[PDB]
Subunit: 185 residues, 2 copies
């Protein structure tokens, strides 16, 4: 009965997408789409198929097509996913002066970023990875202890986010905070 | 000036896709698309934007939008890629009886399959991989020698193709030939 194409779509936050609602029955009494998103109707055969441009999609949504055929009423849902890199990625303020032999805690804060299911927050010592974790909460915080050694000198520590959309057909988008320099003694 | 969305698309062989040709200039003297593909024109503002449904795309194509603005004439191309698993995947006919201690050659033939840039042909001994190679030519052949040992008994050999579209946002589609049993002595 009812069908929608694409059934799944990934688009940048605030973007637009074309959705086609279709129905296989001879005489559709009604065919349309239910969604609160700003919409515009275009024209194909008009009757068995309808095309809509959904615009300024700010967050995930599942618009659904529908058609009332004489045989029965059915629906078809399309899942829209919006992406955007974090609006802010920084390490919580930490004293520059740090006691040798004592423990220090790094805390990264990531505000925003979606889809969260593909966003990872990582803490680094120079170019080395210290911790990796899925981004959870708002802001998404990630923490780790670091035993201050003399080895830790002009070691710059940083936080990085990885929005990996490659499995969706796009790319990995990375972001980095300002570095933190450990001044010991 | 001219723009096209999507600028790149991957679709199954014989499928359809919606293409929107746009132009940023005030008064476009002309706006359209050049492509030999079966097309249908839908309607958005009509003037600065036009939508077309390209149908039954059988092979890769690069339809281009165009617009003649007073400022100048420009173009924008969209690259369409069609996919389809091989129409046939089999090992060249080989005698069932095979001399111990002598060399045997396996030869897989893969007819079709696209995009070829993501199709790999692999030869296997049971579930073990013996050879892997990008699919080249038509039919795409892949060969390997196998030193017949007594170890090679009711060893079934097979050929598999991997159409890896995961980097495009889809999945890996696999195909396998009939197995070949080595009857020695
Ligand atoms: C994050 O990286 C994107 C590109 O990947 C860039 O456009 C954006 O400005 C960066 N965001 C921040 C907060 O630095
Ligand atoms: C190859 O696999 C696809 C699904 O991945 C299947 O639909 C098709 O029939 C297979 N082709 C052959 C020749 O077996």
């Amino acid at each position: 009965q009812t069908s929608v194409s694409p059934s799944k779509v990934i688009l940048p936050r605030g973007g637009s997408v074309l959705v086609t609602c279709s129905t296989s029955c001879d005489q559709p009494k009604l065919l349309g789409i239910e969604t609160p998103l700003p919409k515009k109707e275009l024209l194909l055969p008009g009757n068995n198929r309808k095309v809509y441009e959904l615009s300024n999609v700010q967050e995930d949504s599942q618009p659904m097509c529908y058609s009332n055929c004489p045989d029965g009423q059915s629906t078809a849902k399309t899942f829209l996913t919006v992406y955007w890199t974090p609006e802010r990625v920084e390490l919580a303020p930490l004293p520059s002066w740090q006691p040798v032999g004592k423990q220090l805690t790094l805390r990264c804060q990531v505000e925003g970023g979606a889809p969260r299911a593909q966003l990872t927050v990582v803490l680094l010592r120079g170019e080395k990875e210290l911790k990796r974790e899925p981004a959870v909460g708002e802001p998404a915080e990630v923490t780790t202890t670091v035993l201050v050694r003399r080895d830790h000198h002009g070691a710059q520590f940083s936080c990085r986010t990885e929005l990996d959309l490659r499995p969706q057909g796009l790319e990995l988008f990375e972001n980095t905070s300002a570095p933190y320099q450990l001044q010991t003694f």
